[PDB]
Structure formats: structure tokens, C-alpha cells
Amino acid sequence: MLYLTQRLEIPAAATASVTLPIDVRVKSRVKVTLNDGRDAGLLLPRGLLLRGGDVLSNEEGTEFVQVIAADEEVSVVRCDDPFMLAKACYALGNRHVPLQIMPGELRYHHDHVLDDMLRQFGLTVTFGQLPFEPEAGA
């Protein structure tokens, strides 16, 4: 069976790819299915956060799988004013919410309670299936 046991520090041309959500990209052992249909198992050393772009390889060196971050149910928070986001980041941080941070934009795992809370800060909160890359730590 195809087992992906390593993440190459120096990539080699991809032979396959796999599109995974953040909850799977933090597991060291688990069964996933490549985008071409073949089953495969992750057998990586623990504590690795797989980011879109990383290349996994089988023990030998004949299979190089490109990791891609899947579209996940997230909440979006956009607003020209970064100061308001800064307060949102502090609030979300205080609640330990895995968060993606980019100039002008913020996303986090869909959660109604969180949505409405920020919906009292006056913040604009939408929803959509998008790639999710939270800041390291979870």
C-alpha cells in the first residue's frame, strides 16, 4: 500500500497530489485518498503541520505527493479598518480560536456563536467554503 513517510525539505516534481482540510494536515497517522483516487496513509513524525505546497515522499523516493489545502466551511471577516480586526484577533486569541491572519482579512472554522459575538462588535461576518491556513500553534 502507498505510504507517505516524509516531507522533503527539497521538493522533487510531483507525481500526485492530495487536498486536505486543516484538521487532517495536523495528524501524523491517518488514511487519505489522493486526488487521483488511490488510497494512501500518512506515516510522518508527529508535530508537523502540513501546508499547501509541501511535498510528501514514500520511503524509497518514487512517489512525490503535493499537498493542497482544501476548501473548508469558514467564517470570513473583512474590513478596511485593521484596528477593528486587531481587536477581533485579540478576542479570538483569548478564546483560542485557530485563526488565519492576512492584511484586511480573517477566517476561522465556522461557528455561529463566534459569528454573532463578532456581530455585536459591529463586524461584518460571512460564510464560504475556502482554503484555511491558520497561524501555527494548532
* Interface pattern 105-124 for a second copy (x via CB under 8 A): -----------x--xxxx-x
CA 103 to chain centroid, in Å, comes to 18
CB of 80 to a second copy, least distance (A): 10
C-alpha 110/C-alpha 7 separation (Å) is 29
Closer CB to a second copy, residue 24 or residue 89? 89
Chain residues 1-60 in contact with a second copy, contact rule CB under 8 A: 9-14, 17, 19, 35, 52-55
* Interface pattern 96-135 for Cu ion (x via CB under 5 A): ----------------x-----------------------
CA distances from 15 to 4, 12, 83, 92, 122 (A): 12, 9, 44, 39, 47
Residue where the block lists cell 455585536: 120
Chain residues 78-97 in contact with a second copy, contact rule CB under 8 A: 82-83, 85-87, 89-96
Burial 23-54 (b: 16+ CB within 10 A, else e): ebbbeeeeebebeeeeebebebeeeeebeeeb
Strands 64-69 and 55-57: antiparallel
Task: State the residues that interact with a second copy by CB under 8 A.
Answer: 9-14, 17, 19, 35, 52-55, 66, 68-69, 82-83, 85-87, 89-96, 99, 101-103, 116, 119-122, 124, 131, 133, 135, 137-138
Residues lying near Cu ion in the complex (CB under 5 A): 112
